[PDB]
Amino acid sequence: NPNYCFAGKTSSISDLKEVPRKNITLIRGLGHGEVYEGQVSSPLQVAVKTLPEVCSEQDELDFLMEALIISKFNHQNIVRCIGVSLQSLPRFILLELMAGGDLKSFLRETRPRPSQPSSLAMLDLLHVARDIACGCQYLEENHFIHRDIAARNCLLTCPGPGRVAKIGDFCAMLPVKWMPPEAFMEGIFTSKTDTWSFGVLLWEIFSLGYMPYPSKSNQEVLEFVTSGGRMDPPKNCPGPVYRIMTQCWQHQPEDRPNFAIILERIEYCTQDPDVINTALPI
Ligand SMILES: Cc1cc(-c2cnc3ccc(N[C@@H](C)c4ccc(F)cc4F)nn23)n[nH]1
């Protein structure tokens, strides 16, 4: 019944590809509604996001809206929507399977150790950062504000070389630690509010999945950031990369880069041997 607009065109539930329910098979649980690995009847491998049957009426419309929103993107750095199963219960959104999993656990689980000497290098992190910036620029070019850019909301196509990172998810619960001053004080959101969050995600990537402001509470962060406090560089983080983070966290939004420039700056970093030859901490 409710419709939705993006890049000039309005659409509704009717435009979603409704796949029969008996053609969908679940398998293993992947994470928390919850997400399952699935199969659609060379059969097609999918992820299935479920809406719990025990839920309010508000929850279902939020769910419906998400299928519409994700179905409407066409970009290689945003997880594809395969289809939906809304007419049988529980309701399903079918999504591109991302064998690399969540970006945060990936960083946490593949951190170099004497076990995995160089299981990952500086250049691999920059490529992950560029990928998400590319998806964010597409969002920005289409006047869509994500509001929750974070490693926990990014996914990887595979574990090994050639992995591609894509955006995969859309009071006290607000992710304060990823929000610029104008977001949490005034509720003002812009493409520049996504820019701030991307800087934090950038800290997330180069810290290899450490929680931001590791010893601060949400309120301490709110007071810290307002007073002009910013995070220190991740361990061993190259200066050119840290410089992108600090520019993303400029206090006035008009002084933060748009995503075209951020993309431009990340690519420049990948052309700098002193950046890409820096060893990750073990
Ligand atoms: C949509 C999709 C998810 C996977 C996948 C593949 N391996 C995993 C492992 C955990 C996971 N956790 C869930 C809760 C999740 C994490 C991050 C995110 F951005 C979205 C998301 F649903 N998801 N996951 N492939 N495709």
Q: How far apart are CA 191 and CA 182, in angstroms?
A: 12
Q: CA–CA distance from 138 to each of 7, 78, 225, 258 (Å)?
A: 11, 9, 28, 11
**Architecture, CATH, for domain 98-272:** Orthogonal Bundle (1.10)
Is residue 47 within 6 Å of ligand 1 at its C-beta?
A: yes
Q: What is the resolution of this structure in A?
A: 2.8
What residue segments make up the domains of the chain, in order of their start?
1-97, 98-272
Ligand 1 centroid to Cα of residue 18, in Å, is 22
In sequence order, the 6+-apart residues with CB closer than 8 A to the CB of 33 are 49, 50, 51, 52, 63
For residue 10, what is the enclosing H or E element? strand 9-12
For tokens 């969908």, the residue is: 24
Q: How far apart are CA 243 and CA 265, in angstroms?
A: 10
In sequence order, the 6+-apart residues with CB closer than 8 A to the CB of 97 are 37, 45, 46, 47
- Annotated ligand binding at 194? The verdict is no
Experimental method: X-ray
Q: Residues 100, 155: contact at Cβ < 8 Å?
A: yes
For residue 99, which atom of ligand 1 is closest to its CA? 6
For tokens 């007073």, the residue is: 227
- Annotated ligand binding at 34? The verdict is no
**Strand-pair category, 81-85 with 44-50:** unpaired
Beta bridge partners of 154: 167
**Strand-pair category, 92-96 with 154-156:** unpaired
SS3 of residue 192 by DSSP:
helix
Q: Residues 148, 177: contact at Cβ < 8 Å?
A: no
- Axis-axis angle for helices 239-248, 191-206 (nearest 10): 150
Q: What is the CATH number that goes with domain 1-97?
A: 3.30.200.20
Q: CA–CA distance from 224 to each of 201, 217, 220, 242 (Å)?
A: 18, 10, 6, 19
Q: Which two tokens stand for residue 107?
A: 């960083």
